Write a protein that binds this ligand. Structure first.
Ligand SMILES: Nc1ncnc2c1ncn2[C@@H]1O[C@H](COP(=O)(O)OP(=O)(O)OP(=O)(O)O)[C@@H](O)[C@H]1O
Ligand SMILES: Nc1ncnc2c1ncn2[C@@H]1O[C@H](COP(=O)(O)OP(=O)(O)OP(=O)(O)O)[C@@H](O)[C@H]1O
Ligand SMILES: Nc1ncnc2c1ncn2[C@@H]1O[C@H](COP(=O)(O)OP(=O)(O)OP(=O)(O)O)[C@@H](O)[C@H]1O
Ligand SMILES: [Mg+2]
Ligand SMILES: [Mg+2]
Ligand SMILES: [Mg+2]
Ligand SMILES: [Mg+2]
Ligand SMILES: [Zn+2]
Ligand SMILES: [Zn+2]
Lengths: 164, 257, 257, 257
């Protein structure tokens, strides 16, 4: 062993509005974990691959968030802030993006999936629901490694000027 | 009972500050400073493992909570027929990185990231002749892709294995030779063992010409045989109520070799 | 402290514009222009990797608005025993694409469309003898179906594996040999190291016959031995407070080889 | 110091441009131009090996910018009982290629490959009597299938080995005889050693009839005896503080033969 070392893992700081799908994707990339791997590591199994698609029948339970809060050092109350608050309706399929936010903070925001959200009040821009250059839909936020459209390679920060 | 505590002490292991150890450590400091890959070679039981194991404590980690530890020297002994995945497991388990499952590709990528994140500068591979010939490619890539001095340790069997792959041969050709003890160095070591290791109630005077003659014949200069003979001789002496290693007890032990 | 910055420099690598490198670059330009597959072969530590790697830096990618980047030359080094899917992943990841799921056929197909999407014209596979035998079939397909100058790099081990598939032997028939240094060219490389690499405050006259003698015996013409010897000798000399390499330090280094 | 520098020089070897060396070189140049195989035969220590070394140094490899070298003359000395794989390994390593692990057939085909492309015109096999009888078939095939002048070198023991196989005998029928020195040629050779080899501060006057008498009795015309007597006599003389060889020291050495 390395003497006086504590068993450790690569951590990531969650951004102020980062979605759980985006967060788990970064944590998985930081540790080169497959989606099945993190679920086995937390012991919740295939559930992680389901959450990364925003498939929330059922929602992330107290048990499973506290389980993920054992391998991720982020506490379960902060993990619950990566999800819609109680009774806020959300949509999983059309993945959406502000772009002007992504130039400031490279994360998907869970509020971009709310059924009540359509503009960024900070930027006063209509949030995108597909790539404005090539019309390809955005991939699940767990897969936003490159920070660009997977088809035409336009960076999300440039898509800010193609909004509203 | 006092006897049970002396046996519990004598059956154990200790590190004596031999000049051979000092010579290796100063040499490793230069190789670590230059990040040069090299090999340590010497016949069996000459103290290579103990001297290399002593070097990692001399560079013990520093860590902050929620961070990878700073670990300048990694030491691993692979198991026999170590393939690349087991190599990556040994490294990440030494650094106590928590991910123990995944493909060889994940284990490679996590290992290179862990080595970089922990700031490793020297990797010591003890009994490196246990590595499979295909896994030396990953060892070479650690030394090339990262600024890491890789140190291969083994017996002359390692010199044979390295010559079968020119790419390893031309990377690891700087070497240190571990020697057996002889002459006055052996006589000096025998008296250090009595005073630092055995610490029996009464002086055995192993330094004496006749005791030194027995030890010289039985040890052949192997430090492993010196330690194993003198500790067992002490344990036998103490168990029969002697206060010192007697001639007859040392001869009883020596005639087992 | 001044010493720390020089040691931190001397432990690092640098690129020297040797005529051996210029020869490959002009030759690779001909094979790329003619869109011709070929191979690069030479003994270990002759500098093949550094010359090929320098060539990739000489032709960094280019971009246009709302278009993927264009990447004139791709340089990859497979991991040992590279299977087809991991070669596609290597190429895909170099082009910054990602492919999380698929059959090997799907990885192949995605590779073909991203290669032609970025319009690459030369693919250099360094240590191509790490490819699995079947992976050369897919390498052959990528060469023919798209018209990429595939450049295989290796030691004489690469020639030994290429002789085992007639179709690989046929399309990679053209080759360049990396030689070792010799004669006045070795001497010129020694002085290029003194002034363009070592840069120590006082000259060492390593170009002198008595220095060239020990250097020739220790280096034997391998540019990797030359670099590793002189950098350690410089680091050792500065650690001793010397302003230069001394013959005695150069002897102390050369004794290890 | 003077003495140790002079001793270190005299201890060594050097090449003197004797007429019999030039005679062989012009003959080998004819045979190489014609690609005619032949043999060189002469008594032990008559200088055959040095003259063959001098030839391949006058016809060393030529570089052509990333091509394999053009190497018109290959010189090998087989180890005792040289089998075919040993022979192929000798040839391949001379051409600066590493022998990859494989069968005799792989070694043959690789050797045949690199004898072409390197443009080898002449292969000199010194101590050709060390070849196993089955190895001569592969030597004959190199001469037959490539246009290569193979030169077998040996003593009269070679002329007996060759006559045990008509197919070898009939191919290497043309020969040159290396002779011993005598007469005026020996007197000139002694003069040249004094001036060009020993280079003592003071003239040893080895042309003198009394000195020639000693030298002729002990040397018996063998250039090997001439060299190794005069060097040892010079080393003995300098060690005694003499600045030349003298008759007493020369007789003291010559008495041991
Ligand atoms: N510095 C030391 N201080 C005390 N005991 C030592 C020391 N070095 C060696 N020994 C004794 O010798 C034994 C053998 O030493 P060690 O394990 O280091 O040998 P080795 O050279 O690595 O052998 P091998 O090549 O056979 O694996 C130790 O277990 C210990 O009993
Ligand atoms: N052009 C160069 N400029 C400076 N240093 C060089 C150059 N070429 C080689 N070196 C030195 O020699 C070392 C070995 O060179 P390189 O990595 O290119 O080896 P290689 O020929 O690809 O060998 P192998 O076939 O064993 O992988 C380098 O890491 C560097 O220290
Ligand atoms: N041209 C020469 N110049 C200087 N010394 C020479 C020369 N030729 C021979 N010698 C001396 O004679 C010694 C014997 O010569 P050499 O090795 O060439 O003999 P050889 O004919 O190949 O003998 P053998 O058949 O016994 O192997 C040399 O090692 C050297 O000391
Ligand atoms: Mg819908
Ligand atoms: Mg050991
Ligand atoms: Mg290389
Ligand atoms: Mg000879
Ligand atoms: Zn916004
Ligand atoms: Zn797009």
């Amino acid at each position: 062993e390395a003497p006086d070392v504590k068993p450790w893992l690569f951590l990531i700081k969650p951004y102020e509005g980062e979605s759980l799908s985006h967060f788990l994707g970064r944590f998985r990339r930081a540790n080169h974990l497959s989606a099945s791997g993190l679920g086995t590591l937390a012991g919740i199994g295939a559930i992680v691959a389901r959450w990364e698609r925003f498939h929330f029948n059922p929602r992330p339970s107290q048990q499973e968030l506290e389980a993920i809060a054992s391998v991720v050092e982020v506490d379960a109350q902060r993990l619950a802030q990566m999800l819609p608050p109680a009774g806020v309706g959300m949509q999983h399929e059309p993945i959406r993006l502000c772009g002007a936010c992504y130039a400031e903070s490279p994360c998907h925001r869970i509020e971009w999936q709310y059924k009540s959200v359509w503009k960024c009040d900070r930027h006063q821009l209509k949030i995108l629901a597909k790539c404005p250059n090539c019309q390809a839909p955005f991939k699940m936020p767990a897969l936003w490694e490159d920070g660009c459209c997977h088809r035409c390679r336009m960076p999300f920060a440039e898509m800010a000027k193609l909004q509203k | 009972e006092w006897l049970q505590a002396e046996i519990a002490r004598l059956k154990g292991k200790s590190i004596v500050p031999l000049q051979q150890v000092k010579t290796l450590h100063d040499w490793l400091d230069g190789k670590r400073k230059a990040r040069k890959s090299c090999r340590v070679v010497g016949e069996s039981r000459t103290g290579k493992t103990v001297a290399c194991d002593a070097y990692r404590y001399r560079h013990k980690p520093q860590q902050e909570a929620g961070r990878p530890p700073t670990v300048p020297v990694v030491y691993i002994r692979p198991h026999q027929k170590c393939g690349p995945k087991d190599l990556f497991k040994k490294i990440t388990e030494y650094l106590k990185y928590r991910v123990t499952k995944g493909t060889v590709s994940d284990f490679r990528d996590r290992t290179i990231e862990v080595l970089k994140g922990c700031g490793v500068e020297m990797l010591i591979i003890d009994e490196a002749d246990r590595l499979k010939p295909e896994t030396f490619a990953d060892v070479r890539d650690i030394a090339e892709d990262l600024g890491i001095a890789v140190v291969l340790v083994g017996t002359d069997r390692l010199d044979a294995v390295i010559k079968r792959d020119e790419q390893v041969l031309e990377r690891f050709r700087a070497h240190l030779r571990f020697g057996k003890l002889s002459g006055e160095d052996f006589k000096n070591t025998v008296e250090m063992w009595e005073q630092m290791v055995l610490k029996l109630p009464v002086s055995s005077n192993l330094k004496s010409k006749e005791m030194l003659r027995i030890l010289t014949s039985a040890t052949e200069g192997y430090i492993g045989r010196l330690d194993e003979i003198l500790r067992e001789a002490a344990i036998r002496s103490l168990s029969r109520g002697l206060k010192k290693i007697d001639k007859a007890v040392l001869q009883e032990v020596a005639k087992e070799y």
